[PDB]
Design a binder for this molecule. Structure first.
Ligand SMILES: Nc1ncnc2c1ncn2[C@@H]1O[C@H](COP(=O)(O)OP(=O)(O)O)[C@@H](O)[C@H]1O
Ligand SMILES: Nc1ncnc2c1ncn2[C@@H]1O[C@H](COP(=O)(O)OP(=O)(O)O)[C@@H](O)[C@H]1O
Ligand SMILES: N[C@@H](CC(=O)O)C(=O)O
Ligand SMILES: N[C@@H](CC(=O)O)C(=O)O
Ligand SMILES: [Cl-]
Ligand SMILES: [Cl-]
Ligand SMILES: [Mg+2]
Ligand SMILES: [Mg+2]
Lengths: 447, 447
């Protein structure tokens, strides 16, 4: 019986916002664990610095980073103590940025980028104690154990359970606990990150590990809509939806949720709430086990910068293996594909961006290619965008093909993958036409 | 420089037909090799007998078989010699049918069914010599070596080359040679068959092995149409088309050609002609390397009684393997799939009928299932029909989705697989609505 609350960039971008969020945490006494991302802009600045920047640009970034932190600092009642700390963090960030300028790696990046959520959670506790509140700071790294895959580390569920009950539970009993999402620590103590947007994932993870009654995702939009409001102005809010529905929404482009948030949700039936931190009375969306009478079409999701890796065979093995093998190469290079389409011995692979914390993460390695290039002719098309329609029983229902492609006459559909799930129908279209399609569909579909 | 001609059931169903076909062979002196299927109805009768029938029904079948053969026999000039032989064949067919009534197997079936093309080719030579023609009978089994996969044996290309030049070439130099398609012999002398419609395949095979200038397919329809004339009355004939186009037409339902006919065609660039044996002046379709300015939509193909094997995971291995493995099971059971569609860890498999000479060939074995059932939840939907659209550059062209699904509003599209080939777009629909769909499409597409 403990609700876990999560606040994103915008929700803790500055003192005021941080306050709006602090209020919310104190509107419900069941909120015992808070999860914060770093303030808006921090992570991008930090990532640009882990790329290795020259003296000039480097200094600009470090200052943009220091400003944001002091905007908040200079508003506190007793800014002396945390100033020391911030200075260390800032100073350390500085030395790391100097190192990045000479050598860089996904591990250095995770370590430097981790600093954002560290500074944000330190300040938040201060904003909470400035109100006479028992609120203590906690380093998730003591609990969030992950593998050594830097940039997008994967959580060790068992480990996260023992630890959380041995170091985090007692702290929850005593009082309030503020910690950071997105980061973790590997076996040999090195810092890791779960991948962009990972703060959502962290919230669901600790919720499961602590047997919480619920998780609250506080963002900059009141709930989950029928599509990105930034693309469809006329986007309608969705008051309530179910796990797999949303699970697939996130997976195909519903940025509001990290594609891995709901895994723990489903595994422990921990409903998740989604609302605006700047307007908690507009009302958000609740994600739960199962709904009332689920529509046929809930929403549309867009996933940009997709890559289409089409594989034809140099005709040397039998399809059985030609495939069984092809899939045993991606098993080594551990390249996961959400969408595949075939035609005899021609297999078109739909590749999503990494979502890794480190920019330079390049999916198609030359080792891979030459291994595949000889085993079967390769093809790679870029600047393609995936469009997904999520609903229910689309496979055993009528009029789906006409309803979706009746408006797309003027476009080039490059790939259509449908039939594997009664919840979705996806397809590719050239990047530039991406949004106009989302609009056209949504229109004669939800409006 | 030798043209190879092939005649199907209807084309040698009876004396007259056999004659029509004999004429055609003598309208071109480059025709040195003729390939005959058994007379219409024979193979089905023979297959029903290899299933094991009781005394009564068995006797009816043997008589329907003897009648058809005597209809031709009783019209010859000197019917005495071949009568002896036919009697043996008939007698042997009889004893085999008696054995089938007690024990049955794909090997007994191939051996009994082989008898059809044996009787037809024996008579044809007689129809040719009744016209003072140097025409000799030849047993393809001496040359058509295949593996031991009875019901749908696979040709050993190398072996077929050495043999054909050592036993068949000399016979072609001397004069005319009549032999049988559809059948072969395995390593240990046992008789095999290439699978229903395999007589087309045989024609292409020997053409490649003998370095022929061409192959002529004589059927009961003047050329290759934009779709089965038996479904679309308004079906238009296609005067000329290219390998991959047609290759895919056959593969997805264009019965006029066995799905494996063009493999040798492509491998040796041996153009293939397709015309009616009852009307050689209506004109047929020529299949060659490449065309003029290939349409965007050539035709539609229907493949009935498809099975949709959808695989969801019991969530115990990582997608990489979950797939890499799934495909390494079908690699053992050697289950080939032309059409696959995925969605994360859910993979929907499109399964075609065996096309095997033996009816009882059941694709989904219980060994397989329980091996798959535990590794990942299974699903099986039957009575589904595949619809394919063949053309050119459908992937990098516009309006494809609207053009195809604009008419199918009233239907349930169950699977859409597209993007792997710039030549086709396929999809499933419940069996009963199959033809009405083919008609609706073809209409606002070719008419
Ligand atoms: N279907 C959808 N419903 C609601 N928001 C969506 C949807 N698809 C995309 N979004 C976008 O995701 C945003 C919230 O994500 P994010 O920027 O990561 O914030 P946070 O820091 O709170 O995690 C919304 O502001 C919106 O731009
Ligand atoms: N696209 C198509 N073009 C021409 N015929 C087709 C097509 N699709 C299917 N067919 C069918 O295939 C038939 C010929 O095949 P088949 O019955 O095996 O004869 P054969 O014994 O000559 O091989 C046609 O009579 C027609 O019913
Ligand atoms: N702070 C990380 C993680 C998150 O926002 O959830 C980022 O900016 O992507
Ligand atoms: N005679 C076999 C092979 C063929 O017709 O091509 C059958 O009836 O299917
Ligand atoms: Cl940022
Ligand atoms: Cl038959
Ligand atoms: Mg986020
Ligand atoms: Mg045939």
């Amino acid at each position: 019986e403990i609700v876990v609350s999560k606040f994103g960039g915008t929700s803790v971008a500055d003192f005021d916002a941080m306050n709006r969020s602090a209020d919310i945490v104190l509107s419900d006494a069941n909120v015992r664990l808070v999860v914060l991302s770093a303030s808006a802009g921090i992570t991008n600045l930090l990532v640009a610095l882990a790329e290795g920047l020259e003296p000039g640009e480097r200094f600009e970034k470090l200052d943009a980073i220091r400003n944001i932190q002091f905007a908040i600092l200079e508003r506190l009642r007793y800014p002396n103590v945390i100033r020391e700390e911030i200075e260390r963090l800032l100073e350390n960030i500085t030395v790391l940025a100097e190192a990045a300028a000479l050598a860089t790696s996904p591990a250095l990046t995770d370590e430097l980028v981790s600093h954002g959520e560290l500074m944000s959670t330190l300040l938040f506790v201060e904003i909470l104690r400035e109100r006479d509140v028992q609120a203590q700071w906690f380093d998730v790294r003591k609990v969030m154990r992950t593998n050594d895959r830097f940039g997008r580390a994967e959580p060790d569920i068992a480990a996260l359970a023992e630890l959380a009950a041995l170091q985090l539970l007692p702290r929850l009993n005593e009082g309030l606990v503020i910690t950071q999402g997105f980061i973790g620590s590997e076996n040999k103590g090195r810092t890791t990150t779960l991948g962009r947007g990972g703060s959502d994932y962290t919230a669901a993870l600790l919720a499961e590990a602590l047997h919480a009654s619920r998780v609250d995702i506080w963002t900059d939009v009141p709930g989950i809509y029928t599509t990105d409001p930034r693309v469809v102005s006329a986007a309608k809010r969705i008051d309530e939806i179910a796990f797999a529905e949303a699970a697939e929404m996130a997976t195909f482009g519903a940025k509001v949720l990290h594609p891995a948030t709901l895994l723990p949700a489903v595994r422990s039936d921990i409903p998740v709430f989604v609302g605006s931190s700047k307007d908690p009375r507009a009302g958000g969306t609740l994600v739960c086990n199962k709904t009332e009478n689920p529509p046929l079409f809930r929403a549309l999701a867009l996933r940009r910068n997709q890559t289409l890796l089409t594989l034809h065979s140099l005709n040397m093995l039998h399809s059985r293996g030609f495939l069984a093998e092809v899939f045993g190469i991606l098993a080594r290079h551990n390249i996961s594909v959400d969408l595949i389409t075939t035609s005899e011995v021609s297999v078109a692979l739909t590749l999503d961006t990494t979502g890794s914390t480190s920019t330079g993460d390049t999916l198609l390695t030359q080792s891979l290619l030459m291994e595949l290039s000889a085993l079967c002719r390769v093809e790679v098309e870029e600047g393609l965008a995936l469009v997904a329609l999520i609903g229910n029983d689309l496979s055993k229902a009528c009029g789906v093909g006409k309803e979706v492609f009746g408006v797309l006459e003027p476009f080039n559909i490059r790939m259509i993958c449908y039939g594997a799930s009664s919840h979705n129908l996806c397809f590719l279209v050239p990047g530039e036409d991406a949004e106009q399609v989302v609009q056209k569909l949504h229109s004669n579909l939800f409006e």
